[PDB]
Design a protein around this ligand. Structure first.
Ligand code: SF4
Lengths: 85, 77, 214, 85
């Protein structure tokens, strides 16, 4: 349908700062990614599943070692066990 | 069309001289610009424009158009 | 049922520029699309309301500086529902790139533009208003209105839920039969939400109807 | 050492844009961040000073600040502030 022939051939920016700009969650409620009280961690996991820079997000999160929120489709203890493994 | 319009003679027919017309048009243009700038706020201050304008028209041109049309008055304080 | 509601919303005056931009982006994303034909991109937005199409065309012309056609021929073909379609062909690529549908010289953005999100509460409620104008319904089949508005893909629906949360108004995303929407069930949230969008007479009528029936 | 108007206007725009990003955060989060960094007054107060207003513990002030930094340091609210850095 309205796919623009996979981004088409009309582009003038020819400039990218980094993989932040390709983040899908930026098009989405930030609050849902930090479940307070008990919360849930599956809808935002589904959102991350379709992210095109999931690997980069996971790598950056692990390298900087944030212990809050859900990054790369994984929550805190998945990151912790991956770090410990 | 442009800086040429409206004709200067028609404007001068509505005032005393060029020197007063300059101040008159400039004051009206400042009023219009001030109205536009604070349009985001819900405010009752300044009024206009009183004519049909374009997407992005210089307030001075609108002021001159209203002056020519005869929709303004000048007093001495 | 909803015709009066959408008429009242369309007739609401708007002043702030950012909220107008957000409303235009929302309506274009929900009830709009792009087509690459003859080597150029053309934007087509289909509305089923009288004043809404004119409002969208005026907003485009004013803030984004573009011209539209406002054809009345029904794409459905019935010609009874007055399926208005507003078209933008001249500078379609510029409008698409500068309104948030496409960014980064890449694929169309599934969710709402990032500019609309992380904005003031006024822009969030304007985006919700545009979403309701584009698509939605007010059923009141049984005990609750089910103020449901459908969205393309989970991303737009959950973004609308997030925007509603910033208004301190409860909302719930749902998916059924492969199509997903956002709904709010309890009457209090329905009334507060409809009040915030700007409708007044419809809000009253709904209030008395609910209080008398319930 | 001459005030360049472009730089001054850029700093003013940065100052005005910073507050908006804090606005979307919860009341307590924005308040504690502002008091800790003294954006409103310019005096960075101690953790006990911040906790005195809300009555929460020192450790609570330590944690609440960390969650805000995690939220802002996310691929969901960074774009608005990436350019100014
Ligand atoms: S993987 Fe990272 S960048 Fe992608 S949507 Fe999830 S949190 Fe955002």
């Amino acid at each position: 349908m309205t796919e623009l022939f996979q981004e088409l051939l009309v582009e003038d920016a020819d400039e990218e700062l980094g993989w932040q700009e390709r983040a899908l969650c930026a098009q989405t409620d930030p609050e849902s990614f930090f479940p307070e009280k008990g919360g849930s961690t599956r809808e935002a996991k589904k959102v991350c599943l379709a992210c095109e820079v999931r690997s980069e997000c996971l790598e950056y999160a692990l390298q900087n070692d944030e212990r809050f929120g859900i990054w790369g489709g994984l929550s805190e203890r998945e990151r912790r066990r991956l770090k410990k493994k | 069309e442009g800086i040429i319009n409206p004709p200067i003679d028609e404007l001068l027919e509505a005032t005393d001289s060029k020197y007063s017309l300059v101040i008159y048009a400039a004051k009206r243009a400042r009023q219009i610009n001030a109205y536009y700038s604070q349009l985001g706020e819900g405010l009752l201050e300044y009024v206009g424009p009183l004519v049909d304008t374009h997407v992005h028209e210089k307030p001075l041109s609108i002021a001159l158009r209203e002056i020519n049309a005869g929709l303004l008055t000048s007093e001495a304080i | 049922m909803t015709a009066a509601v959408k008429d009242e919303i369309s007739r609401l005056p708007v002043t702030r520029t950012c909220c107008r931009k957000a409303e235009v982006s929302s309506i274009l994303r929900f009830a709009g699309g792009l087509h690459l034909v003859s080597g150029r991109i053309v934007i087509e937005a289909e509305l089923d309301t009288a004043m809404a199409a004119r409002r969208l065309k005026r907003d485009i012309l004013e803030i984004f500086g573009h011209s539209s056609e406002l054809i009345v021929m029904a794409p459905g073909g019935l010609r009874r529902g007055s399926r208005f379609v507003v078209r933008v062909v001249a500078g379609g690529d510029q409008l698409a790139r500068q309104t948030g549908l496409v960014d980064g010289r890449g694929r169309p953005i599934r969710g709402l533009p990032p500019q609309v999100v992380s904005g003031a509460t006024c822009d969030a409620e304007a985006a919700w208003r545009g979403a309701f104008l584009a698509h939605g319904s007010l059923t009141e089949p049984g005990r609750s209105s089910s103020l449901e508005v459908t969205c393309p893909g989970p991303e737009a629906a959950l973004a609308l839920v997030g925007a509603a949360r910033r208004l301190s108004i409860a909302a719930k995303a749902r998916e059924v039969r492969g199509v997903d929407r956002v709904v709010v069930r309890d009457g209090d949230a329905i009334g507060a939400l409809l009040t915030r969008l700007g409708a007044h007479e419809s809000v009253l009528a709904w209030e008395e109807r609910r209080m008398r029936r319930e | 050492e001459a005030v360049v108007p472009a730089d001054a206007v850029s700093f003013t725009l940065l100052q005005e844009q910073l507050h908006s990003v804090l606005d979307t955060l919860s009341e307590r989060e924005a308040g504690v961040v502002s008091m800790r960094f003294g954006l409103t007054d310019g005096q960075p107060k101690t953790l006990d000073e911040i906790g005195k207003v809300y009555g929460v513990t020192r450790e609570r002030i330590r944690q609440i600040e960390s969650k805000t930094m995690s939220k802002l340091r996310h691929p969901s609210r960074s774009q608005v502030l990436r350019d100014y850095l």
